[PDB]
């Protein structure tokens, strides 16, 4: 199945064949209470002193428990959990290219960034969220220091020359209608 | 940032003024060290460390959450093959005097975002503008050209100050004087 | 805009990355938020202690 | 007398707010609720609902 599935889009093998062939299953929450689920497949289905040895399912990837805005945090497991919630919320204000035909939309209130970049360290599930095609942010050389005194309580210090060169410059669009 | 570290620009220094490493890499953004220890966003530092490996190797790092292959000894061993300190510190110089800073500063590339809360959409002032019609007090809202609200909690804090004249000016003479 | 290829989404001035899933109502995109509720057709024995009842078999 | 906010204006501010606005659920429990048990992350939302993305206001 891995090899046939690697050669999809070259012929026509897909997810529906994995479901029809009887390999994956849609288990849900009232039925999930009687599965015995393994988290990774090798490592929980190997042989030691026994934990259960009667597994009935196995997870595809454990990081598929995160949602859309939470799946763009890199290393969310090294963070204190309220911080991951704040980023889930602040990632929806990040300016960036919000859509590709943005010159045809006459939205009220659009913000687009001039020069958005792709993250240099990404998670693997921000491929499907199509984040490297419509990214929202710039990879900047941060320097955790305490320099003059101006960055002192949740404040930062930016480079004026970097900004002169177009760093996080953005454009704001407001639309008015009348008939 | 992508980890819950919000905060505003505090000042902007040119390039001659930012601190700089032994080649002229000045930071773009300098955040404060005190934002880290209480919030325990270690993922921020691991990302700033792997972004340096990624920009030196020349390909994009992986930060999927539960991953067993990546840890910090492994990133650190790679970083020291490009001739950096294995922990990401560098030796910066003062931009104003040129003298080395006796602490080695932790610098590397992190992906920042730019949130849509700019200041020039929040600055707001009033001195005798338009007025409501029912109770002839200033209008509300920044776009209506309103005035700020001197609510009740602000009035108890003025009673406790024993400030009877500022209290009757804010509640009579600068709001809705009549005879 | 359905089953329509990618040149044609762009010829109609659209983006091929748009997900879909929303309505246009007077030229506003509106989304329907999913609302949860209790499962129907199922017996649930609770216990409200703040009444005259020891138990309650809702359905 | 109806429900409200069942239909909201789609958020086109960045692609990740569009995508998350389209996959959003809603528990209808009112606000002005001093109870916690419907706001707690139940064990049973494992793999179904994101355990990190919630609004930090009163909702």
């Amino acid at each position: 199945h891995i090899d046939q599935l690697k050669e999809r889009e070259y012929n026509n093998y897909s997810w529906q064949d994995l479901v029809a062939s009887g390999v994956v299953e849609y288990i849900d929450t009232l039925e999930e209470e009687t599965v015995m689920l393994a988290m990774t497949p090798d490592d929980l289905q190997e042989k030691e002193v026994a934990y259960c040895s009667t597994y009935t399912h196995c997870e595809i990837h454990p990081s598929m428990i995160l949602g859309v805005c939470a799946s763009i945090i890199p290393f969310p497991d090294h963070n204190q959990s309220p911080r991951n919630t704040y980023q889930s919320a602040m990632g929806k204000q990040a300016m960036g290219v919000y859509i590709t035909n943005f010159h045809v939309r006459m939205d009220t209130l659009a913000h687009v960034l001039y020069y958005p970049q792709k993250p240099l360290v990404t998670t693997r599930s921000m491929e499907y969220l199509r984040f490297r095609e419509l990214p929202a942010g710039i990879n900047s050389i941060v320097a955790i220091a305490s320099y003059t005194g101006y960055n002192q309580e949740d404040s930062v210090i930016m480079n004026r020359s970097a900004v002169d060169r177009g760093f996080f410059r953005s454009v704001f669009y407001r639309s008015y209608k009348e008939q | 940032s992508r980890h819950g570290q919000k905060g505003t620009c505090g000042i902007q220094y040119r390039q001659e003024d930012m601190p700089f490493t032994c080649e002229g890499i000045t930071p773009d953004i300098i955040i404060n060290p005190h934002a880290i220890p209480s919030r325990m966003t270690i993922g921020h530092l691991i990302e700033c460390l792997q972004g340096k490996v990624s920009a030196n190797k020349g390909e994009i790092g992986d930060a999927t959450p539960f991953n067993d292959a990546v840890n910090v000894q492994k990133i650190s061993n790679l970083l020291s093959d490009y001739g950096y300190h294995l922990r990401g510190n560098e030796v910066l110089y003062n931009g104003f005097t040129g003298r080395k800073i006796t602490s080695q500063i932790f610098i590397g590339p992190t992906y920042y975002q730019r949130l849509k809360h700019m200041v020039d959409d929040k600055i707001h002032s009033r001195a005798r503008g338009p007025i409501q019609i029912l109770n002839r007090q200033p209008m509300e809202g920044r776009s209506r050209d309103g005035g700020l609200r001197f609510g009740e909690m602000e009035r108890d804090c003025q009673i406790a100050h024993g400030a009877a004249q500022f209290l009757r000016e804010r509640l009579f003479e600068a709001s809705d004087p009549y005879q | 805009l359905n089953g329509l290829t990618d040149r044609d989404l762009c010829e109609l001035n659209e983006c091929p990355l748009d997900p879909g899933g929303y309505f246009i109502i007077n030229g506003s995109e509106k989304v329907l938020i999913a609302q949860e509720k209790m499962a129907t057709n199922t017996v649930y024995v609770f216990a409200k202690k703040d009444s005259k009842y020891a138990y309650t078999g809702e359905c | 007398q109806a429900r409200a906010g069942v239909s909201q204006v789609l958020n086109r501010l960045t692609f990740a707010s569009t995508l998350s606005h389209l996959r959003r659920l809603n528990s209808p429990i009112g606000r002005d609720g001093k109870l916690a048990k419907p706001r707690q992350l139940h064990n049973t939302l494992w793999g179904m609902v994101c355990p990190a993305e919630t609004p930090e206001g009163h909702a």
Binding site: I2, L5, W15, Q16, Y128 | - | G20, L32 | L19, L22
Partner: peptide
């Protein structure tokens, strides 16, 4: 024949096939 420790490359092929077939807003 089974797939062992060559499995992070294979755990993500079935994820990519799932997201080709079903977008993200399929539930709508």
């Amino acid at each position: 024949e089974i797939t062992p420790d060559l499995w992070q490359e294979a755990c993500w092929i079935v994820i990519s096939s799932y997201f080709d077939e079903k977008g993200l807003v399929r539930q709508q």
